[PDB]
């Protein structure tokens, strides 16, 4: 209980400080992974060889919505195709509609109606933070054992 209270106070602390809010339940990760995949294909302004490694970053952002449904026993491939079908109908219309994963029912959901929101400051340092940590692990070719 003490861990839940201290985590709740620090989560609301960033709500009053930062005026920006992001929806949770995988709404930010699914939209970002789909946007980055179709952005570089249309623009083609990076490189031909670099887009190979960029695809690995886009596919690595879909593990969070697949993890939430994995603990509940739901098929991660079923819930992934249902969200993509809703995002395709949202791209045709010029309006703005957000889609998110509903863990209770198993289908998609509107994160604004359900009320699942995540802090902007937490998710802003989550992408940049996990980038530098995972990159440094790939830069070590050989393990160095010394000092004794």
């Amino acid at each position: 209980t003490k861990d839940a209270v201290r985590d709740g106070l620090r989560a609301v602390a960033n709500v009053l400080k930062d005026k920006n809010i992001i929806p949770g339940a995988g709404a930010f990760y699914i939209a970002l992974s789909r946007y980055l995949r179709s952005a570089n294909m249309n623009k083609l302004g990076a490189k031909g060889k670099t887009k190979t490694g960029i695809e690995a970053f886009a596919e690595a952002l879909l593990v969070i919505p697949k993890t939430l449904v994995k603990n509940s026993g739901f098929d991660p491939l079923d819930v992934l195709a249902m969200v993509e079908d809703e995002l395709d109908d949202a791209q045709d219309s010029d309006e703005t509609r957000y889609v998110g994963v509903d863990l209770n029912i198993g289908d998609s959901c509107d994160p604004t109606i359900e009320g699942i929101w995540d802090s902007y400051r937490v998710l802003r340092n989550a992408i940049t933070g996990a980038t530098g940590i995972a990159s440094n692990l790939l830069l070590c070719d050989e393990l160095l054992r010394a000092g004794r």
């Binding site: 209980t1 839940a4 209270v5 709740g8 989560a11 009053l16």
Partner: protein, 78 residues
């Protein structure tokens, strides 16, 4: 944030407590917020379902006398 760390049955109890905890101590202005000003008391006696929010401050050792009044409304602190 609450539904993650509990079984979701305690969230409905702590929903009004956590929400009113920040808004009461923090007046609405530019200012800033301080989480250290919010005291945390731990008790192993009562069940977690009966927990409540404390707007003021609580102390450990009180005076023990049999004739002390149970409830005192609008008391002066000196």
């Amino acid at each position: 944030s609450l539904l993650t760390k509990v079984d979701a049955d305690l969230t409905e109890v702590l929903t009004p407590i956590v929400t009113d905890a920040v808004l009461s101590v923090y007046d609405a202005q530019a200012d800033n917020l301080d989480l250290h000003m919010v005291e945390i008391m731990q008790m192993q006696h009562l069940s977690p379902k009966d927990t409540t929010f404390i707007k003021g401050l609580v102390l450990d050792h009180g005076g023990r006398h049999p004739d002390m009044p149970t409830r005192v409304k609008n008391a002066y602190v000196l």
